[PDB]
Scaffold this motif. Sequence first.
Motif, PDB file in Angstrom:
ATOM      1  N   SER A  81       0.830  -1.194   0.000  1.00 13.82           N
ATOM      2  CA  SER A  81       0.000   0.000   0.000  1.00 13.82           C
ATOM      3  C   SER A  81       0.872   1.254   0.000  1.00 13.82           C
ATOM      4  O   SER A  81       2.087   1.201   0.191  1.00 13.82           O
ATOM      5  CB  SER A  81      -0.935   0.003   1.207  1.00 13.82           C
ATOM      6  N   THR A  82       0.226   2.403  -0.217  1.00 12.88           N
ATOM      7  CA  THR A  82       0.965   3.656  -0.350  1.00 12.88           C
ATOM      8  C   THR A  82       1.700   4.008   0.937  1.00 12.88           C
ATOM      9  O   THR A  82       2.909   4.271   0.924  1.00 12.88           O
ATOM     10  CB  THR A  82       0.016   4.785  -0.748  1.00 12.88           C
ATOM     11  N   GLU A  83       0.986   4.019   2.065  1.00 14.87           N
ATOM     12  CA  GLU A  83       1.618   4.369   3.333  1.00 14.87           C
ATOM     13  C   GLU A  83       2.667   3.338   3.732  1.00 14.87           C
ATOM     14  O   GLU A  83       3.742   3.701   4.223  1.00 14.87           O
ATOM     15  CB  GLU A  83       0.560   4.516   4.427  1.00 14.87           C
ATOM     16  N   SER A 132       4.376   1.357   1.667  1.00 14.60           N
ATOM     17  CA  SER A 132       5.515   1.495   0.764  1.00 14.60           C
ATOM     18  C   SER A 132       6.340   2.726   1.105  1.00 14.60           C
ATOM     19  O   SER A 132       7.559   2.738   0.906  1.00 14.60           O
ATOM     20  CB  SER A 132       5.041   1.558  -0.686  1.00 14.60           C
ATOM     21  N   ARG A 169      -2.984   0.897  -3.880  1.00 12.60           N
ATOM     22  CA  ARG A 169      -2.500   2.261  -4.049  1.00 12.60           C
ATOM     23  C   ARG A 169      -3.615   3.299  -4.064  1.00 12.60           C
ATOM     24  O   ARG A 169      -3.319   4.496  -4.128  1.00 12.60           O
ATOM     25  CB  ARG A 169      -1.677   2.368  -5.334  1.00 12.60           C
ATOM     26  N   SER A 170      -4.881   2.878  -4.010  1.00  7.29           N
ATOM     27  CA  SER A 170      -6.006   3.806  -3.992  1.00  7.29           C
ATOM     28  C   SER A 170      -7.058   3.410  -2.963  1.00  7.29           C
ATOM     29  O   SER A 170      -8.251   3.424  -3.271  1.00  7.29           O
ATOM     30  CB  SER A 170      -6.644   3.914  -5.376  1.00  7.29           C
TER      31      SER A 170
END
Lengths: 458, 258, 86
Positions: free
Chosen positions: B157-159, B161, C49-50
């Motif tokens: 996930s973004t956080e 990563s 990512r979303s």
Amino acid sequence: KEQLIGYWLAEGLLLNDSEKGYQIIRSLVSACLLQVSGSMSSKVKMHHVIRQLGLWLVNKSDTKFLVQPGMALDNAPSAEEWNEATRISIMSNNITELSFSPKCKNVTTLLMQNNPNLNKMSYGFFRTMSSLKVLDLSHTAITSLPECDALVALEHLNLSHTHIMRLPERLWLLKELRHLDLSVTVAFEDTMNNCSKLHKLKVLNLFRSHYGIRDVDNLNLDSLKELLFLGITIYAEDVLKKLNMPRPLAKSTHRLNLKYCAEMQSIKISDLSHMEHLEELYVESCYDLNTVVADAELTTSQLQFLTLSVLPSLESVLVAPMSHNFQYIRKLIISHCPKLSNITWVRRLQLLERLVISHCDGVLEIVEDTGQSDFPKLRLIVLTGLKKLRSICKAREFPCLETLRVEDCPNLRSIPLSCTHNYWKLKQICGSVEWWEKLQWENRKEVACLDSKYFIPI
Amino acid sequence: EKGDSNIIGVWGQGGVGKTTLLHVFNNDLEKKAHDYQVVIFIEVSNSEALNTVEIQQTISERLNLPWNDAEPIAKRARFLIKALGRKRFVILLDDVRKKFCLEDVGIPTPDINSQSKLILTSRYREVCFQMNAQRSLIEMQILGNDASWELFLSKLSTETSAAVEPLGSQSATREHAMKIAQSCGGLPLALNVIGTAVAGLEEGEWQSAADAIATNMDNIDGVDEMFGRLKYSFDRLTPTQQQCFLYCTLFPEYGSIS
Amino acid sequence: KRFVILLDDVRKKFCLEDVGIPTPDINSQSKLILTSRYREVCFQMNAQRSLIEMQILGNDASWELFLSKLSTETSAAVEPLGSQSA
Ligand SMILES: Nc1ncnc2c1ncn2[C@@H]1O[C@H](COP(=O)(O)OP(=O)(O)OP(=O)(O)O)[C@@H](O)[C@H]1O
């Protein structure tokens, strides 16, 4: 999370694996059955409707639970309700007397944590608790504990923050015990020499306990062959130099408390380098302590949480400029140190997360005299009772902060926080209006901006 | 493009990327220029019993042929052999688990006199040898050290990563994530499953997960169906081979044995 | 076509191409929005990512939601202000 995983380990739900407990917690929080919440993600909680769903499912199940925590109960529940229940919880109640002897044959868990007034438990209370696996009496006022030879299958026993002075001799006959905790036991004074009979024990904790290994005569913990993690209070330099050799008893310690330290006017992290597991240090009432060395010589041990409390003669700690053992620090608690006058080293703490400064009038500023901020990973700042502090630190960017709390600081002139930063993580700010009057501002708009955005009056 | 034999075999362990290789190869043909007229992709992995019916359905649908449902299988096979012989075809077979005769399914075996090609993928080198692909075999090797890592990164996930991606700022979470990635052995299926399992790991939990992943994989999400997927290569074995394979599991990890 | 597909309460990982939905990619303008109780499912379906978390309602919005659920005479007992009652 750690406390819950401990119980999951004692109860037998986890096959002696703590990572399995962490995986279970993460699976629950990913299904929205639990919520990660707090100043740090180490705490979990349940939504009110989800807790009611859990209670409803328990009632629908064929294994009854007795669940009355946080109910502000003034007296213990009727002993007849304890018959068929398997889990008992009396947390956060105001229970004062526990006199009946229940019929809890099937019970596998007893919780009485945070009972501030429960100090009279009737002898023979544990007679029917043969299958009791988890027993918690944390933060209760009991000074003595009933004999427990009937606790054949007990594996976890917690007595932190309780006024127990002497510990009954029946525990050394509990063959199945795995974890025993007596941290911050103020009145505990009973010799542990009989703990050698407790072979199966895996974890033993005496952190911040008033009594511990005061002399080498009670350094017989090498009989604890199954032990993995331990925290204890060390009182003298000769004890440290008896323990400054590579052996499991020295390296298995994860945290130390230092109280009434004799001849330890100075201490170096290199001396603690043989404590490869140590992560937290507590120093309280070390009268003759003067200086501490934070060497550049790194160690496999990762120092995480420190608390300096009631130190009337500590002056300064030598911290290396380039590399140091403190770079893995997460929490700092500075309290009751009037003669301490050097805290500049905090600016080199790039992993630091929690700040607690209290009653240390000897600290002129939190930071006195790379394109990076001095506090890139900071989350929480707590200030209390500073009667002579001027300011926190020089102007730096603090975008990752979450909460700031200042109480009873009539001398604080200014804070490094400013509107120049971008804020999305700053959840709340709590403090007094007089402090706002005495606060200096980088811009005159900050008088209203920092008030209307985050300030919450006390 | 250049190989002499018209039957090409690709072999590799389960999850190495054979089917994905076929997908990216078929999708790559529509970009370049080639003399072939039909590129047929057939999934023989449906069973080991060789379901002729839907393979013939795929071939006929791909050849613009009408589906005569009541026609016998042998007659349809002969008809397809006649039909496919008129075109320069490329047939991509997926995960063929047993030797099967091409002429009984309708596919003519390509020969030197014909420009047609036939690419088959299978976990077993024995199958690729049985299907006359010995002179054009390729071993599908595991992913490299850097490609495996950057595959692992895209799975987080973004956080999450944001904790292991950055450099310059140094912390042990990168080391723990790299240890978890290396525990996958460069197998793309392993990278996908493990990265998905730990896609939401918080900053402070990387240490324990990385420590536990080095010894066991039963407590990690999604790996049970992984082993169910990879278990067929073991179930294919005779009981003696099964015992001999299990006997090799008690040797030390990362250690070659004679 | 430039499609938008809204999936509701997907409880297990499933293959989009098996149901007929093509997985959207950067080259395509198509979008795909899926909702699920489990973050693990949203990670399995390549939505890491979303991801968005649906948080509970606020203190005031929940109250005005509660008010609209009451009858007229019952609401008349808890709506009024200026007059103070338990
Ligand atoms: N180069 C790659 N980059 C990213 N993912 C890959 C790559 N190669 C394979 N994968 C992943 O591997 C996963 C396993 O399926 P894949 O098609 O690769 O299996 P396979 O090699 O055909 O094995 P088998 O058919 O025996 O299961 C797929 O979900 C795919 O996303």
